[PDB]
Design an enzyme around this catalytic site. Structure first.
Site, mmCIF file in Angstrom:
data_model
loop_
_atom_site.group_PDB
_atom_site.id
_atom_site.type_symbol
_atom_site.label_atom_id
_atom_site.label_comp_id
_atom_site.label_asym_id
_atom_site.label_seq_id
_atom_site.Cartn_x
_atom_site.Cartn_y
_atom_site.Cartn_z
ATOM 1 N N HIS A 175 12.467 -10.261 -5.093
ATOM 2 C CA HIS A 175 12.283 -11.686 -4.887
ATOM 3 C C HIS A 175 13.624 -12.371 -4.665
ATOM 4 C CE1 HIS A 175 8.897 -10.057 -7.234
ATOM 5 N NE2 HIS A 175 8.163 -10.893 -6.526
HETATM 6 C C1 FAD Z 1 7.882 -4.494 -2.525
HETATM 7 C C2 FAD Z 1 7.560 -5.953 -2.356
HETATM 8 C C3 FAD Z 1 6.751 -6.586 -3.291
HETATM 9 C C4 FAD Z 1 6.437 -7.934 -3.167
HETATM 10 N N1 FAD Z 1 5.633 -8.516 -4.122
HETATM 11 C C5 FAD Z 1 5.348 -9.764 -3.995
HETATM 12 C C6 FAD Z 1 4.500 -10.368 -4.996
HETATM 13 O O1 FAD Z 1 4.021 -9.800 -5.974
HETATM 14 N N2 FAD Z 1 4.250 -11.693 -4.779
HETATM 15 C C7 FAD Z 1 4.729 -12.448 -3.730
HETATM 16 O O2 FAD Z 1 4.419 -13.640 -3.673
HETATM 17 N N3 FAD Z 1 5.525 -11.871 -2.787
HETATM 18 C C8 FAD Z 1 5.811 -10.604 -2.922
HETATM 19 N N4 FAD Z 1 6.626 -10.025 -1.996
HETATM 20 C C9 FAD Z 1 7.074 -10.828 -0.852
HETATM 21 C C10 FAD Z 1 8.373 -11.580 -1.086
HETATM 22 O O3 FAD Z 1 8.457 -11.988 -2.449
HETATM 23 C C11 FAD Z 1 8.398 -12.797 -0.161
HETATM 24 O O4 FAD Z 1 7.122 -12.893 0.459
HETATM 25 C C12 FAD Z 1 9.444 -12.743 0.949
HETATM 26 O O5 FAD Z 1 10.677 -13.258 0.452
HETATM 27 C C13 FAD Z 1 9.047 -13.505 2.194
HETATM 28 O O6 FAD Z 1 10.190 -14.250 2.666
HETATM 29 P P1 FAD Z 1 10.492 -14.409 4.204
HETATM 30 O O7 FAD Z 1 9.258 -14.188 4.955
HETATM 31 O O8 FAD Z 1 11.200 -15.741 4.462
HETATM 32 O O9 FAD Z 1 11.538 -13.261 4.526
HETATM 33 P P2 FAD Z 1 11.277 -11.978 5.418
HETATM 34 O O10 FAD Z 1 9.849 -11.586 5.343
HETATM 35 O O11 FAD Z 1 12.238 -10.903 4.939
HETATM 36 O O12 FAD Z 1 11.704 -12.406 6.870
HETATM 37 C C14 FAD Z 1 12.503 -11.536 7.701
HETATM 38 C C15 FAD Z 1 11.761 -11.204 8.975
HETATM 39 O O13 FAD Z 1 12.660 -11.303 10.101
HETATM 40 C C16 FAD Z 1 12.714 -10.073 10.794
HETATM 41 N N5 FAD Z 1 14.084 -9.864 11.239
HETATM 42 C C17 FAD Z 1 15.162 -9.559 10.456
HETATM 43 N N6 FAD Z 1 16.288 -9.438 11.117
HETATM 44 C C18 FAD Z 1 15.923 -9.683 12.429
HETATM 45 C C19 FAD Z 1 16.657 -9.705 13.629
HETATM 46 N N7 FAD Z 1 17.969 -9.469 13.700
HETATM 47 N N8 FAD Z 1 15.991 -9.982 14.768
HETATM 48 C C20 FAD Z 1 14.680 -10.222 14.702
HETATM 49 N N9 FAD Z 1 13.883 -10.227 13.632
HETATM 50 C C21 FAD Z 1 14.569 -9.948 12.520
HETATM 51 C C22 FAD Z 1 12.216 -9.019 9.818
HETATM 52 O O14 FAD Z 1 11.613 -7.973 10.562
HETATM 53 C C23 FAD Z 1 11.160 -9.804 9.043
HETATM 54 O O15 FAD Z 1 9.929 -9.819 9.754
HETATM 55 C C24 FAD Z 1 6.950 -8.660 -2.085
HETATM 56 C C25 FAD Z 1 7.753 -8.032 -1.142
HETATM 57 C C26 FAD Z 1 8.067 -6.683 -1.270
HETATM 58 C C27 FAD Z 1 8.944 -6.028 -0.240
#
Ligand code: FAD
Ligand code: FAD
Lengths: 645, 645
Positions: B573
């Site tokens: 997280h």
């Molecule tokens: C093992 C695990 C367990 C989790 N458990 C929970 C849970 O219990 N509860 C919960 O609410 N959430 C959970 N999560 C999710 C997490 O807590 C959040 O949902 C996450 O921080 C989502 O944030 P985000 O979408 O902004 O970031 P991200 O999803 O990391 O956004 C990054 C995205 O951009 C893309 N990207 C990166 N670099 C580039 C680039 N150079 N060019 C193009 N695209 C790129 C990546 O492919 C990805 O799709 C879990 C995640 C994991 C991995």
């Protein structure tokens, strides 16, 4: 072909400022002939600890001031006042000049010295903007760690200065008259408000503080680095790695490794300049508008004599082929600061605990304060404004460990092997001796010209009546009198140190060992029993006193005089070689021709009050303005810095 | 040619919301550069049980958080506080970002954290509309099956919270001040009215409930599926199978497999962006109005340094060719949640009957509740508003089976082979450690940048008096104190568990095995005999107590401190990498230029109170509003959902 009109000779502390700001606000062509390379990657020069031999391989543990890869090595002629011994002092050899190999201090020089010592248009109010600019560009840093030694010193100083304010004496050494009647000694407790000795309006000539300002910059990682003229003004952001300007500075060329021989000269308009590349080939940069000399105190006059302007009879006697102008003041009147040395011993149950955190570091570099004083009361050679203005005369310092050379260490027997020592230094700031520079070969830039600099010349009595040969003895003995009064000043603080250390819950004993205390207590007795005429006893043949008291006091003076001659360091803080009024006017312009001007520390008509780095930077800024015709550096906002990379 | 003005970099949990609603209510051109493909058919990703390896072929039983086809694999630098071991955590690699590979929780973050932790314009009342919108769009589901374990826990909690309401302590851990003085614990009987911890007006900061909210949707057939950002916002209904918009969304382009290197940059208006297709060819999308960064906590700052905006001295030292802006706060101040682990044993005739229906399922996914707590009473690092407002600090969980790694299993000897185990977890929510991110290669998007994150650093006593080195020991030892207080909290519920289970007609015995109980009872004795100064015994050298009682208590602390370092999981997280006030303003806009803004979870100035999915969705909604200029998502009726296909 290498046509030019801006031609700077040397990237010193003043060459970098001048070139950087001149190219910033102007679109001429600029060639900077430097003769050194850029030590951007050399770990010893970037890390400040490398100044103290962290990287030296075991065979060759030396300091960069001696290493010939880093610094020019002139050797002065024997000093008749110090047992005919010859000194070697260093001008830097790198972009940024001496700043690359220096000890990184920033004392700006107070109000008094420039206001009453510098000509019209250079007063403190007329230049303080430039000083603000340069101290802003560097942005030095202090130490903020506690050390009980400095607190001891500063509270003893308060104790003594309270007596000095009373008793009505108007020129004693712990007096300040801008702060009413009392210098503002820094407080002694946790996080007390700091005293900045480089105040913008020069309130503090005399003061006490607790750490200095050094040219480092803490990095995000945790390692400190050197921050110097080459580092700020000329780094990768502005100058190409081959020596070409970048974008906004596109009209800026740096020939890194080029020694200038002379300036070829036509009519009375200098037209061309010659240099020698590493690969051995002469070239010639044509000069369209001006040439600039920023090649240090020592070498600048040499450049002038080889160019053709100087004393005709002497230069013809040695045989320079071309004569241009007969100016017999070229390269006259050199000056420098001086620093004797003094030790203290400590004897008590917890003295080791009394001196912790005194090892040199990346922010302090073997400094622990600790003051700045004025004339002693009984000084006879004071300016007529001593009574109404306070003067910066003694630059107190302090350090842990032993500072005396190993031979003196053998003689006194006091070694750092027995851990009871720290040093107090009274760096003279208004030192009297004056010398001069000549050349001996009209061939190329050497590494050692004729330099004569005699310090401690003793008086030779004559058959003239004493009543009109005391005021030549006085002016001859001036440096001895000043050094001895500094000895008195340091001596009469150590007892207040004893008192305040015993009364602050510390049970230790303090007693000077080098020079031995007994000499000094005898000196104190003689001083306060003989009055202002204490210095009449340098020449026992003139007083004609056979009373054993005067005989013993004169003997004490005689045996004491050995130590300033033997146990001292010579300061690298050369200055004042082509002074305003001597060979140039207030426009820095050389008298006799139309297109050559000197813009370095040689032009200063008087030595400033501190480690002579900031003054040359100021001169560079002001000369940028003078050539420009309008003040922009003075009018730049203070918080614009050149980029750092 | 690929001209654009809306340019989103990354379809994370915040990229999908932003792109979907921005394209819904606006008619600009939108390119969404994503670098992943759509796992619409992959049975392992759709079926939630596939998270637990139902489909893995026998050779390669791994979890998608490790598989490189699914997740980026940064490796952090060694943790000096946890025996210098290096962790690997996962950012998702698919449309929808981390949501594709997550554990599906929905804790929204209470009133307190945003109201007193987030700047003006982001208070709880100013954004709660967006949170309503996103929790509405997902519409998660709960479990409604009975389990006696959760009832045992919740009735024990009631028992203890009734003592806590009395005795007048104002910051104990089972206290809520929005509900007068008493948290509303969920009832214990058939079909009791449920407590929703994600209440719309944030009444419940502290509460007890009985199941969580997960991102599934029961299908008509009888099979549950993953429901995530890519699934909702970008499915076949709106986006063509080649990556083109449909009808109303016709101005919406999705380049599925494209890694962005940097943003080519002109003046201070970024003009173009480069990406690399699977077939190896560079392209360039021209930028007319703005660019959007939604590429996760880790990679966003890296994008910024490679773009050109960041610390000049460091980036120049490694050698990025272009410099734009000197913002030495880029990518600073990372945070994350942490979760130690604890086991329990059961010994009785019908314990097997006491733990039925605890296997993970398609609706629970190995969760059985079971609470959410606040600061323990004896916590020294509490905010000044602790007394008048209740804070979310510990996130209680519970599960059947064994959670400790097989090595810890060998050491303690407790295996799931002997069926007497369930785990209680106190997921810290206000965890203190702060780290930072850099890059090491200015070349392309790697899979592992420099990440420094040190947790359990022990204190090193110095010679300073204790009276002014306790308040640096406190702030250094903060995480140890918090973890230990959580240990106390879990320990002092198990006895009420024993009581309520014996009194509810169940004859079983409960005793913690990992960590062993004896340590914990000794800790309880020491805590209630030493008071708030119980934490003075982390550094035995400072208390100077030679009484065997204090010696034994300090020994117990010392040997206990091994377990949070060894037996724990690191939470995925991540958050807070480009915070508001650090590198962007309240408009999310990057400080130094005019047309780049960051709109992802890196911008959060503080970590929210739960699994950080909903917060990033909220940020996407709000940034849609900010670019739009008018609130429509806030003003959309709550019951409009995007279509599901
Ligand atoms: C093992 C695990 C367990 C989790 N458990 C929970 C849970 O219990 N509860 C919960 O609410 N959430 C959970 N999560 C999710 C997490 O807590 C959040 O949902 C996450 O921080 C989502 O944030 P985000 O979408 O902004 O970031 P991200 O999803 O990391 O956004 C990054 C995205 O951009 C893309 N990207 C990166 N670099 C580039 C680039 N150079 N060019 C193009 N695209 C790129 C990546 O492919 C990805 O799709 C879990 C995640 C994991 C991995
Ligand atoms: C050991 C040491 C300690 C110091 N400690 C301190 C301190 O504590 N505090 C402080 O403030 N300062 C200190 N300094 C620095 C010194 O006090 C001043 O900074 C110095 O005077 C700078 O003046 P400048 O740059 O004008 O002269 P310089 O730096 O000497 O300028 C001369 C430059 O011109 C170049 N040059 C010379 N001849 C030629 C030629 N023919 N052709 C081309 N280029 C040429 C040289 O290579 C050099 O770069 C120290 C210096 C040294 C060596």
């Amino acid at each position: 072909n290498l046509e030019a009109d801006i031609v700077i000779i040397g990237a010193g502390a003043a060459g970098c400022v001048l070139a950087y700001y001149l190219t910033k606000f102007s679109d001429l062509k600029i060639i900077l002939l430097e003769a050194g390379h850029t030590h951007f990657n050399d770990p010893v020069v970037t890390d400040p600890m490398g100044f103290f031999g962290k990287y030296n391989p075991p065979n060759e543990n030396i300091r960069m001031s001696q290493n010939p890869s880093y610094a020019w090595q002139p050797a002065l002629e024997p000093d008749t006042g110090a047992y005919s011994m010859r000194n070697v002092v260093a001008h830097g050899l790198a972009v940024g000049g001496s700043t690359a190999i220096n000890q990184l201090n920033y004392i700006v020089g107070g109000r008094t010295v420039f206001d009453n010592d510098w000509p019209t248009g250079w007063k403190y109010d007329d230049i303080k903007k430039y000083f603000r600019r340069v101290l802003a560009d560097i942005s030095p840093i202090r130490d903020g760690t506690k050390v009980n030694l400095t607190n001891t010193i500063l509270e003893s100083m308060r104790v003594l200065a309270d007596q000095q304010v009373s008793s009505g004496v108007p020129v004693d050494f712990l007096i300040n008259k801008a702060t009413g009647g009392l210098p503002n000694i820094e407080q002694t407790y946790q996080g007390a408000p700091i005293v900045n000795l480089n105040d913008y309006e020069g309130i503090n000539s005399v003061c006490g503080f607790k750490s200095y300002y050094v040219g480092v910059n803490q990095l995000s990682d945790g390692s400190y680095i050197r921050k110097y003229a080459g580092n700020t003004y000329l780094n990768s952001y502005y100058v190409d790695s081959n020596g070409f300007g970048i974008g906004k500075f596109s009209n800026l060329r740096v020939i890194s490794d080029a020694v200038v021989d002379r300036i070829h000269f036509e009519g009375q308009r200098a037209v061309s300049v010659t240099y020698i590349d590493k690969k051995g080939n002469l070239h010639s940069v044509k000069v369209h508008k001006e040439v600039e000399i920023c090649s240090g105190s020592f070498f600048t006059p040499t450049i002038l004599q080889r160019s053709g302007i100087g004393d005709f009879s002497y230069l013809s006697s040695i045989g320079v082929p071309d004569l241009v102008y007969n100016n017999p003041l070229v390269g006259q009147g050199l000056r420098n600061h001086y620093s004797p040395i003094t030790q203290v011993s400590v004897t008590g149950p917890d003295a080791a605990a009394f001196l912790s955190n005194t090892a040199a570091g990346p922010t302090n570099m073997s400094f622990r304060g600790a003051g700045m004083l004025g004339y002693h009361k009984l000084e006879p050679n004071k300016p007529s404004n001593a009574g109404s203005v306070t003067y910066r005369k003694y630059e107190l310092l302090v350090t842990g460990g032993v500072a005396i050379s190993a031979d003196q260490q053998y003689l006194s027997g006091i070694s750092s092997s027995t851990g009871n020592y720290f040093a107090l230094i009274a760096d003279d700031i208004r030192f009297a001796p004056v010398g001069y520079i000549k050349i001996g070969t009209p061939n190329f830039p050497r590494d050692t010209p004729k330099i004569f600099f005699n310090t401690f010349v003793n008086y030779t009595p004559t058959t003239d009546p004493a009543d009109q040969q005391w005021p030549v003895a006085q002016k001859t003995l001036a440096p001895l009198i000043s050094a001895l009064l500094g000895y008195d000043a340091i001596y009469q603080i150590v007892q207040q140190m004893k008192v305040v250390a015993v009364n602050a819950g510390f049970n230790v004993t303090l007693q000077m060992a080098y020079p031995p205390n007994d000499l000094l207590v005898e000196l104190h007795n003689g001083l306060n029993t003989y009055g202002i005429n204490w210095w009449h006893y340098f020449v026992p043949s003139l007083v004609n006193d056979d009373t054993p008291a005067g005989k013993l006091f004169a003997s004490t003076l005689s045996k004491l005089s050995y130590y300033p001659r033997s146990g001292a360091h010579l300061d690298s803080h050369q200055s004042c070689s082509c002074s305003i009024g001597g060979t140039v006017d207030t426009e820095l312009k050389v008298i006799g021709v139309e297109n050559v001007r000197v813009t370095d520390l040689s032009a200063a008509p008087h030595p400033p009050g501190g480690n002579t780095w900031c003054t040359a930077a100021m001169i560079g800024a002001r000369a940028t303005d003078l050539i420009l015709g309008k003040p922009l550096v003075a009018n730049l906002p203070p918080e614009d810095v050149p980029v750092f990379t």
